[PDB]
């Protein structure tokens, strides 16, 4: 146990700028924001106790501070006051031009025409010859090289201005379904944009891509340091998808990269805190079956500060310890999986949705 071991027994060698990792208890990642307010010191303390790795969300502190990147700057400093080594990521979406940061302030129905260069970065709906939009939120066009340059510089500027340790990039699809004949170009362009960002952030900055395990992100994945399994709907929590997760988590770890295995019980088949606490054992088990060095669990029922980050799920605080080996698929075509850790025995049936972790 001198070095962290992937489930294939190979050694995981982290980069110097990675967050802390340990198997002592479930390795945790947190991600949260609140448009309406900053964290109270007591809330910073609560989260800081439970994680070394978090991300501030897309709108945090927008109302009190006026711009979401100042929310990120505020919390990054608050957390680092407590744990100077905490890793705090700045959020930026690669697809939706959410107008929550100063950087994106022009991407509104009433301002965009006054910014013709920024407007030219956006997808046009061929059905209207006007900007494509989702409730008047416009769509970056990754096929536009000037957008790739602007966006990657902007994100790097947001990481620098906020004092964050890197970036969480949301979305990898580049709206490929809107230009499906160019899907391969979109995937290639996305990789180009991420490589620009990775370079522009300079050394020692973490790049986490959301859902970057998906084939659509293959050109982006190499320059990423981390990828998140978002489990954003029921299909992604199927027994087949969970087995794919576990396969992907090994591949990610073998690449020296980190994974975030994120669960929002809003996507559970079944009052969210009660449900979340009841399902914690099952979803933790799903993570532990596939867990690797420098993989982290995120748990709650959404993305707001009030969506789980400030609740105690006692399973997450129990001693876990290093895995004693890879999971065992109890029968070759069945959906029961077990795995042993130094302080816990995991059993899960992903066909039926039942699990039991026996804490020793």
Q: Are strands 124-125 and 130-131 parallel, antiparallel or unpaired?
A: antiparallel
**What would the two tokens of residue 31 be?**
């991600």
Report the distance separating Cα 80 and Cα 164, nearest Å.
10
How far is residue 236 CA from its own chain's centroid? 15
Other beta carbons within 10 Å of 207: 24
Helix, strand and coil percent figures for the chain, each rounded to 5: 35, 20, 40
Beta bridge partners of 172: none
Report the distance separating Cα 145 and Cα 174, nearest Å.
13
Report the distance separating Cα 211 and Cα 217, nearest Å.
8
- The fold for domain 30-318 equals TIM Barrel (3.20.20)
Q: At what angle do helices 183-201 and 145-162 cross, to 10 degrees?
A: 30
- Would you say how long the chain is, in residues? 360
Q: Can you tell me whether residue 346 is helix, strand or coil?
A: strand
Report the distance separating Cα 22 and Cα 259, nearest Å.
14
Report the distance separating Cα 306 and Cα 70, nearest Å.
20
Helices (H) and strands (E) counted in the chain, each on its own, are 8, 16
Closest by CA to 6, choosing from 329, 323, 339, is: 323
Beta bridge partners of 166: 206
- Burial (CB count <10 Å: 0-12, 13-18, 19+), residue 166: buried
**What would the two tokens of residue 23 be?**
């198997």
Closest by CA to 112, choosing from 122, 125, 101, 102, is: 122
Alpha helices in the chain (DSSP H): 41-50, 62-65, 68-82, 116-119, 145-162, 183-201, 239-254, 272-290
Which value in Å is the resolution of this experimental model?
A: 1.7
- Residues sharing a CB contact under 8 Å with residue 85, sequence separation 6 or more, in sequence order: 19, 20, 52
Domain residue extents for the chain: 30-318
Closest by CA to 302, choosing from 274, 259, 273, is: 273
Solved using: X-ray
Tell me phi and psi for residue 345, to 5 degrees. Answer: -120, 130
């Amino acid at each position: 146990g001198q070095h962290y071991l992937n489930s294939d027994g190979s050694r995981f060698v982290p980069k110097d700028f990675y967050p802390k990792f340990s198997w002592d208890t479930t390795p945790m990642y947190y991600m949260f924001g609140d448009t309406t307010r900053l964290l109270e010191p007591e809330e910073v303390e609560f989260i800081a106790e439970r994680t070394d790795f978090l991300c501030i969300e897309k709108s945090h502190g927008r109302t009190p501070l006026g711009a979401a990147e100042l929310g990120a700057k505020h919390e990054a400093a608050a957390f680092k006051k407590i744990k100077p080594d905490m890793k705090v990521l700045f959020y930026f979406n690669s697809a939706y031009a959410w107008p929550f940061t100063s950087y994106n302030q022009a991407f509104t129905r009433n301002k965009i025409d006054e910014h013709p260069k920024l407007k030219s970065f956006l997808i046009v709906d061929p059905k209207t010859a006007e900007l494509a939009h989702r409730r008047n939120v416009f769509f970056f066009d990754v096929l536009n090289p000037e957008l790739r340059e602007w966006w990657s510089t902007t994100v790097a500027k947001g990481v620098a201005e906020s004092g964050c340790d890197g970036a969480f990039i949301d979305q990898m699809h580049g709206f490929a379904w809107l230009r499906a004949d160019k899907s391969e170009d979109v995937q290639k362009a996305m990789g180009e944009m991420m490589a620009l960002l990775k370079r522009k952030m300079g050394p020692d900055k973490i790049l986490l891509g959301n859902n970057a395990n998906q084939d659509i992100a293959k050109d982006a994945f190499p320059v990423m340091d981390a990828s998140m399994f978002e489990h954003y709907n029921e299909k992604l929590l199927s027994k087949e998808s969970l087995l794919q997760d576990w396969d992907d988590m090994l591949r990610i770890a073998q690449a020296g990269k980190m994974s975030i295995f994120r669960i929002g019980v809003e996507s559970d088949p079944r009052d969210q805190p009660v449900l979340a606490k009841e399902r914690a054992e099952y979803y933790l088990a799903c993570y532990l079956i596939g867990a690797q060095p420098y993989s982290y669990f995120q748990y709650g029922w959404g993305w707001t500060l009030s969506s789980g980050s400030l609740h105690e799920f006692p399973e997450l605080r129990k001693a876990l310890g290093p895995p004693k080996g890879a999971y065992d698929r109890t029968t070759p075509d069945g959906w029961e999986f077990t795995r042993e850790f130094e302080h816990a025995s995991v059993w899960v049936n992903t066909e039926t949705g039942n699990a039991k972790i026996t804490w020793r």
